[PDB]
RNA sequence: CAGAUACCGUCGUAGUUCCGACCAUAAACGAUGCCGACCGGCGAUGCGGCGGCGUUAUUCCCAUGACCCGCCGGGCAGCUUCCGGGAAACCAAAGUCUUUGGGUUCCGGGGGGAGUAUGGUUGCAAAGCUGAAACUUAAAGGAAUUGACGGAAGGGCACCACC
RNA sequence: UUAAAGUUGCUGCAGUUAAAAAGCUCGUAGUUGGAUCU
């Protein structure tokens, strides 16, 4: 059935981006995916997005700038040593000079950027670029 | 000598475009050789990178001809690619060559780290994708040369990437994918979006639009 | 017209390994003769000279000479 | 696919060793009949005394005779 | 290689079907696959029409009709020309030829 | 239009429509066009929406003056009902015109004696002629259409919502972006009535030349 | 782009769709610079100013370049509302 | 089987082309044409492309020819099209339409125009095709 | 042809296991 | 027919049929695991639902049924398309894959030897499940392309084919 | 024996036709599990 839930919004936003659309309803939303998605919009990522509230659970809805190549997920959550961080965005993102890594930390959520600052580990969620 | 048959013909002839970057930046077809030529340079060499022979058959026997692959770089802007059949392997070469000059293309290059200097390398990680080679150039730190195999070393060199961190999978013997493929990579760099460009873009008069007078003279 | 068109030539050399016969076929261009070029054009071609450009007329104009 | 959770350690482990098996190679080390059957027994060279010469006749495309020694 | 993508047969989203014999062999055939034709006649033919027309009892006496449905195994029909085979890509066309003038 | 009272369509002109009737489309809808359209009525006939029609039209105006020398607007019918329509569009306009067949590898071979690198190009169907707008594709013509309400806007870039079938409708169409592209350019005016009457730009037929020849 | 330095490092800075804002490509040629005209509001004759777009060889197989122009020219006042 | 080759239709062709004028209704007049205008050698190559240059005029003044483009041919087309009938065919004192369109007016508040006469919709919806 | 060569086997299979028997 | 213990024909046992026990395999095929999300159109069709002029079951009122025009949710499919894939054939999934991670199960690792040997186990048996090794070998294979050929189908010509 | 081997594949391969998805469904352990609380 549907286990991660964030998963399954990002591979949506990523699919209606490659199609090149305005805009996109991911649903159902979580805390999770709100604070991810803010942390994409400050660095401006994507945009401005809007949480239609039902009795339930959220729909967004998510306006596009076409600034977004990849969106994704890394499935299951790793636990993201600051030493182990390095060889993670070596990995994942196009090159030294953007993209990010953003995990939880018992901090807050984040960019692998402002977490160095922090001098906090924590789990890996996904990157986007 | 040279007679130019079409619009961009002229305004090249008649040193209306200064620089090939007003061609580039409207992504106008280029349809004959020597306005790349004209344009550069003895800054042009070139590899024949492979003469492979191939056979058709008829009721006679095998019927042979030459597939010519050549690759025209300019060290440090530009490279192309091209490929020619034909029964003569002279023929075949210079066309090849007359090919590979119609299909220039401009190569982004990137800063692996701080950014000092003139850019040495790949400006993010591109993947050219040729029927089934896959290949794939990856920033790399300054020094570090190309790492790769010798048929891809050959167009990163001719492109002006210093050094390049390559992996290539696939089936990669067969050389014209590998050639075509990572000439894809190559081709990639300046479709990539980066943070870099995102300001928005202001526009430009057309070459056509803008000399449209000049070319009602002639 | 390949009588006088072209001129063919056969010959043998003799080797070791036997006899090797040879045909050289050559065609000459056309037409005034410069020891080359027979004057007689293929019966084929057709040559269309272009029109003389002619002035269109204005207004009637008589001149007497 | 493959099984991505995190407490699937071991099912991942255990299943690669089975396939491991399938590998003609690591079956060839690892089991030990090909040792057993090796005329050396693992050893680089054998010494040996020679019980006769032997002609052996080339095969196909060429024509020769190998001049062997049955040791 | 998959010749057809409906392999031949019209099977759908039913596992099995009835078969049934072919008219002209006897080969066993699924219902589905079969080859199939209906033919309307008359009884009598071109000629013996104006014949037996005139030897009624019966005035404006209109001829029966013979009426039956055949399959044709796939074998068959290819033999007796019932069904030719076309191109690659005039394969596609599963519209009836056009006996209707 | 800029919303201006001017550019704003008059009543005259929307009676050249009612009765040339190109605000009947074909019983197909394409989805792409679904923004055009009115509403159905029974009969299936689809009602294309004029205020838009309207609007395109002048649309595809501005972009035909934007453009200096006007032999760059290449303008292109296949079938017969543009053919006239066409003709005279170039002419009052001073565009270059392609009717009856259109040749492919006109756009991409300079070794022809037909080749033209047009700036722009002007088409009467998009189904019809396929051909002259997949080659815009390789050469960079951004490109207008007159688009029945099914049409596929493949490649198009400026589409105009019409009937594009009937003869009536196709003249009207084209005679009314000519005078429209001539009172933009600063020639004729605004005020008069255009001389040249909509008529003009028609499909004959035979049977008409035959009753009109006949009839003298 | 910019070095530390600042200079700009780059062979030209290529031009991104008003559309769908991805790169048009070095090579193309399914790419458009469309030139749309202005009016005087005055008058209705024509100014020599000109509001430009620009639309990417994607959307144009897609047709919905045609949509796209469509509300550029909105978001640009140059068609009415409605 | 006569039939003529390339050479014949071709050399017809472009011999029209340039030379329209010069060349007339009559045989014998547009094969001393072409006796002067190119350059032929033999008789029955000659005497052909003539006789084509002939019968191609025979199909020009009938109307547009496929293979030849004159300016000449351009202008008295460019009469026979331009015609127009004493009136409009665009001009009705009554136009007829349908409520719905009636409606789609009465938004861009043309609702007021006079020559209009609405009809009665049609009651039966068929405009499908009976499929089989 | 497989189908046949998987018959010849099983023949030769029977024919094993009769002329081994558990009395071997 | 050279031979035919084979195709063809006349017969005909077991079987084919029903009941009662076993057997567990089929090109058991969509040769495409199952649950889930998203990503183009277009008409159709089956089932339920909802709305809508107008016909019919004779003439007016409601039900109801039959056609008709749509809309919604599941289905069986189809056509279409530079969505994207793919070695290609082709696939709106075989898409969202070097821009590589939604959950999960079975399972492949050159061709043979071989689904054989052996042991274990199930069956009444025929066999089923589980299942090696020595050896041997540079290819075996998959899509597509030109050929050549066919005892395959269509056209076409020629008084060295006929009428 | 290690790399080459993304030819053991966690990163990271495959399974329509190349080697390959169980005839089919139930099912315990095993793995996996929707929103929501400063
Ligand atoms: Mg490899
Ligand atoms: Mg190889
Ligand atoms: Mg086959
Ligand atoms: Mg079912
Ligand atoms: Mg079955
Ligand atoms: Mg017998
Ligand atoms: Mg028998
Ligand atoms: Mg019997
Ligand atoms: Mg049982
Ligand atoms: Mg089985
Ligand atoms: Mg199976
Ligand atoms: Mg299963
Ligand atoms: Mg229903
Ligand atoms: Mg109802
Ligand atoms: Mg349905
Ligand atoms: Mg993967
Ligand atoms: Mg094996
Ligand atoms: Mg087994
Ligand atoms: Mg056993
Ligand atoms: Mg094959
Ligand atoms: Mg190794
Ligand atoms: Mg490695
Ligand atoms: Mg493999
Ligand atoms: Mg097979
Ligand atoms: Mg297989
Ligand atoms: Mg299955
Ligand atoms: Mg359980
Ligand atoms: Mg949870
Ligand atoms: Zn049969």
Redesign the interface.
Same mark, same amino acid.
């Given at each position: 059935v549907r286990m991660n839930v964030l998963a399954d919004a990002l591979k949506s936003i990523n699919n209606a981006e490659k199609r090149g659309k305005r805009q996109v309803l991911i649903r159902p939303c979580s805390k999770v995916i709100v604070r991810f998605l803010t942390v994409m919009m400050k660095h401006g990522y994507i945009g401005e997005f809007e949480i239609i509230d039902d009795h339930r659970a959220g729909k967004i809805v998510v306006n596009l700038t076409g600034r977004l190549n990849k969106c994704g997920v890394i499935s299951p959550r790793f636990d993201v040593q600051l030493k182990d961080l390095e060889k993670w965005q070596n990995n994942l993102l196009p090159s030294r000079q953007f993209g990010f890594i953003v995990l939880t930390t018992s901090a807050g959520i984040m960019d692998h950027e402002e977490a160095r600052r922090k001098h906090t580990g924590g789990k890996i969620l996904g990157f986007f670029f | 000598e040279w007679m130019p048959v079409t619009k961009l013909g002229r305004l090249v002839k008649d040193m209306k475009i200064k620089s090939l970057e007003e061609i580039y930046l409207f992504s106008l077809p280029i349809k004959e050789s020597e306005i790349i030529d004209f344009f550069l340079g003895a800054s042009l060499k070139d590899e024949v990178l492979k003469i492979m022979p191939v056979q058709k058959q008829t009721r006679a026997g095998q019927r042979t001809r030459f597939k010519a692959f050549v690759a025209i770089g300019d060290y440090n802007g530009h490279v192309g690619l091209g490929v020619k059949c034909s029964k003569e392997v002279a023929t075949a070469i210079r066309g090849a060559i007359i090919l590979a000059k119609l299909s220039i293309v401009p190569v982004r290059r990137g800063y692996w780290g701080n950014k000092i200097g003139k850019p040495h390398t790949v400006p993010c990680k591109v993947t050219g994708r040729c029927g089934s080679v896959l290949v794939r150039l990856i920033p790399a730190p300054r020094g570090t040369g190309i790492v790769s195999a010798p048929v891809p070393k050959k167009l990163l060199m001719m492109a002006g990437i210093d050094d390049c961190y390559t992996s290539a999978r696939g089936c990669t013997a067969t050389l014209g994918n590998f050639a075509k493929a990572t000439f894809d990579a190559i081709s990639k760099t300046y479709s990539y979006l980066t943070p870099d460009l995102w300001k928005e873009t202001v526009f430009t008069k057309s070459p056509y639009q803008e000399f449209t007078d000049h070319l009602v003279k002639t | 017209p390949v009588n006088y068109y072209v001129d063919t030539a056969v010959r043998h050399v003799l080797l070791r390994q036997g006899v090797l016969g040879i045909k050289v076929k050559i065609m000459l261009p056309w037409d005034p003769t410069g020891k080359i070029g027979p004057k007689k054009p293929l019966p084929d071609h057709v040559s269309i000279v272009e029109p003389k450009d002619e002035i269109l007329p204005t207004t009637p104009i008589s001149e007497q000479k | 696919g493959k099984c991505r959770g995190l407490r699937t350690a071991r099912k991942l482990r255990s299943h690669r060793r089975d396939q491991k098996w399938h590998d003609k190679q690591y079956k060839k080390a690892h089991l030990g009949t090909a040792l057993k059957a090796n005329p050396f027994g693992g050893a680089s060279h054998a010494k040996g005394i020679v019980l006769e010469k032997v002609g052996v006749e080339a095969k196909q495309p060429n024509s020769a005779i190998r001049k062997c020694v049955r040791v | 290689t998959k010749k057809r993508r409906n392999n031949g047969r019209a099977k759908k989203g039913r596992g099995h079907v009835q078969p049934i014999r072919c008219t002209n062999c006897a080969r066993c055939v699924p219902k589905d696959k079969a080859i199939k034709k209906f033919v309307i006649r008359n009884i009598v033919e071109a000629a013996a029409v104006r014949d037996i027309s005139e030897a009624s009892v019966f005035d404006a006496y209109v001829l029966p009709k013979l009426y039956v449905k055949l399959h044709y195994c796939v074998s068959c029909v290819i033999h007796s020309k019932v069904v030719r085979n076309r191109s690659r890509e005039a394969r596609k066309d599963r519209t009836p030829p056009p006996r209707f003038r | 239009s800029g919303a201006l009272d001017v550019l704003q369509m008059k009543e005259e002109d929307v009676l050249k429509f009612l009765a040339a009737g190109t605000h009947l489309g074909g019983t197909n809808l394409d989805f792409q066009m679904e923004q055009y359209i009115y509403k159905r009525k029974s009969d299936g006939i689809y009602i294309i929406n004029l205020k838009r029609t309207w609007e395109k039209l002048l649309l595809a105006a501005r972009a035909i003056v934007a453009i200096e020398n006007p032999a760059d607007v290449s303008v292109i019918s296949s079938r017969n009902t543009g053919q006239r329509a066409v003709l005279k569009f170039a002419a009052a306009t001073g565009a270059t015109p392609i009717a009856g067949r259109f040749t492919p590898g006109t756009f991409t071979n300079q070794i022809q004696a037909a080749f033209r690198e047009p700036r722009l190009l002007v088409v009467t169907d998009p189904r019809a002629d396929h051909q002259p707008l997949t080659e815009a594709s390789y050469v960079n013509l951004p490109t207008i259409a007159l688009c029945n309400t099914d049409s596929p806007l493949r490649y198009v870039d400026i589409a105009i919502p019409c009937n594009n079938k009937g003869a009536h409708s196709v003249g009207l169409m084209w005679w009314m972006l000519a005078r429209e592209v001539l009172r933009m350019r600063g020639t004729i005016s605004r005020e008069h009535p255009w001389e040249v009457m909509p008529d003009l730009y028609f499909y004959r037929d035979p049977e008409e030349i035959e009753k009109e020849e006949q009839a003298a | 782009?910019?070095?530390?330095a600042g200079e700009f490092?780059?062979?030209?800075?290529?031009?991104?769709?008003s559309?769908?804002?991805?790169?048009?490509?070095?090579?193309?040629?399914?790419?458009?610079?469309?030139?749309?005209?202005?009016?005087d509001?005055?008058? /209705?004759?024509?100014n020599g100013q000109?509001k430009?777009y620009?639309?990417c /060889?994607?959307?144009?197989?897609?047709?919905?370049?045609?949509?796209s122009?469509?509300r550029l020219?909105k978001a640009d /006042?140059?068609?009415?509302?409605? | 089987g006569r039939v003529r080759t390339k050479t014949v239709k071709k050399a017809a062709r472009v011999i029209i082309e340039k030379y329209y004028t010069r060349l007339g209704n009559d045989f014998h007049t547009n094969k001393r044409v072409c006796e002067e205008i190119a350059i032929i050698p033999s008789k029955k190559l000659r005497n052909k492309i003539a006789g084509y240059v002939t019968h191609l005029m025979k199909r020009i003044q009938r109307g547009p020819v496929r293979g030849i483009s004159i300016k000449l041919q351009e202008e008295e087309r460019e009469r026979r099209d331009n015609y127009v009938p004493e009136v409009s065919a665009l001009d009705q004192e009554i136009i007829e339409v349908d409520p719905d369109t009636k409606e789609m007016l009465k938004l861009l508040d043309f609702g007021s125009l006079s020559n209009l006469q609405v009809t009665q919709p049609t009651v039966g919806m068929n405009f499908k095709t009976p499929r089989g | 042809r497989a189908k046949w060569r998987k018959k010849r086997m099983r023949r030769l299979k029977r024919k094993r296991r009769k002329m081994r028997q558990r009395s071997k």
């Open positions: - | - | - | - | - | - | 782009m910019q070095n530390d490092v780059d062979l030209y800075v290529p031009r991104k769709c559309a769908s804002n991805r790169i048009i490509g070095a090579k193309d040629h399914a790419s458009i610079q469309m030139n749309v005209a202005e009016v509001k005055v008058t /209705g004759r024509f000109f430009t620009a639309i /060889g994607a959307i144009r197989r897609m047709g919905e370049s045609d949509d122009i469509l020219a /006042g140059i068609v009415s509302k409605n | - | -």
